[PDB]
Amino acid sequence: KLKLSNTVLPSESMKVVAESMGIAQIQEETCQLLTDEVSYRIKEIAQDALKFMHMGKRQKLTTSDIDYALKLXXXXXXXXXXSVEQQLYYKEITEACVGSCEAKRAEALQSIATDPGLYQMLPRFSTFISEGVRVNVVQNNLALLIYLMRMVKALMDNPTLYLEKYVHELIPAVMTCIVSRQLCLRPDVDNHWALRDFAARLVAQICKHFSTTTNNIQSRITKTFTKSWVDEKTPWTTRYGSIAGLAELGHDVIKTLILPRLQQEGERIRSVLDGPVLSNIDRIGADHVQSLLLKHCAPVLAKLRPPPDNQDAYRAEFGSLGPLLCSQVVKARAQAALQ
């Protein structure tokens, strides 16, 4: 069932190595038997280093190993998927997701991210997690939002629990967290922008795993945010969540998208800036949104264009980017100088 022929070096190459020292005119059978003899000693020593590492008990052979070799009819009532024990464990998980004590919070987060083999307090868990997402979208409460979104983050990093089959009741809750109207209070929309940042960051963590298949991920979320950006007369939370989600998709994504949207969204800027009579909620909202997305979009064209001619680059970017685009280009040159 096996045949072990002799691994014999080509003797002409051996004569090349030999007469590299300039020996003589060599006949073949000499170097043939030389390769034979050296192959015997090599394969003997190979068995020997195998005896080494099969008592050092590793199946990989290092240089050091050979160095040491060189010392020579009513049915029965049902039963759930849970145990009572692990469903009470699940209740601990849920009320720690409620948990005010941040120690209990982080305990829950680690318990999510590092319980592999759990898999069975899967979807039911995640399913009316998503239902709680919908109900608290109605309730419009940022604390439940941040708790669930860090919960989804910790769900995303528990490496065994594969997402695939159970994806499709989770991602829309993320995007509903992205879109709009996270309005606890009008002076307190501030944390919601960071919520959207974190959410789009989570989407970026999603998108690197699943769009090999059916392209729900890339094609649907991109066209979603595309036509969402097209949606005129919408609140700027929608615009921020859309453009932030497109920002999280990557360098070349923005290179495609904000190539016309550079000056088109600059037109949106100077529709907002030097714009209305008075709506300072929307003014301050859209203004810091445009500023954030400006200097967050900046490293694309910084990697794309050289940082010359900031007066021309503002003309190349409809003026309002100038010189905040130029200041971000100075910051990018400083970050390059840090390297």
Place this chain on the structure above:
Amino acid sequence: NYHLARRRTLQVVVSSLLTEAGFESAEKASVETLTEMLQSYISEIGRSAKSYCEHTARTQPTLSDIVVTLVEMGFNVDTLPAYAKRSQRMVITXXXXXXXXXXXXXXXXXXXXXXXXXXXXXXXXXXXXXXXXXXXXXXXXXXXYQVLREKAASQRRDVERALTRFMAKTGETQSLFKDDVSTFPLIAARPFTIPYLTALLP
């Protein structure tokens, strides 16, 4: 893999000594081979001193031991102060690098339930019940007496009014008001041939 950085640290020492020499260029594989030769020279010192200070019944290799070792290993030690003028006085010492950490975690369930049960050994840590043990789910008691018979009687009332609505709109219908097919469509009279066999029949 993680062993390798000390070997490349020795390569850094090699480059430092070449800088003290003054070679602008080099042959890289020869440099690393010389580095291997250096670490084998270190280990050769160590083997020599190892088997040499076992000639005492005690272990600790002292200074003159290593003196006789290096003279045994062929070196004029008299240049060692003078080489100090080259060594710690013309080459800057490089620093080491080791970035070790112990991360934090917390997975607090509340179940131990057997500290050192019958196989008693007070050197372990019982995991939980949340992973190891299991349970059983019956999940449906529903035994609320008056509520139960409320359910049953309400359902009987439902089937009453259902069949009433069905044969109401089905058969001959006469009303209470005019044209109540919605609210009260009473079945009209059959009258049939033999009443007594019907009305006196259990």
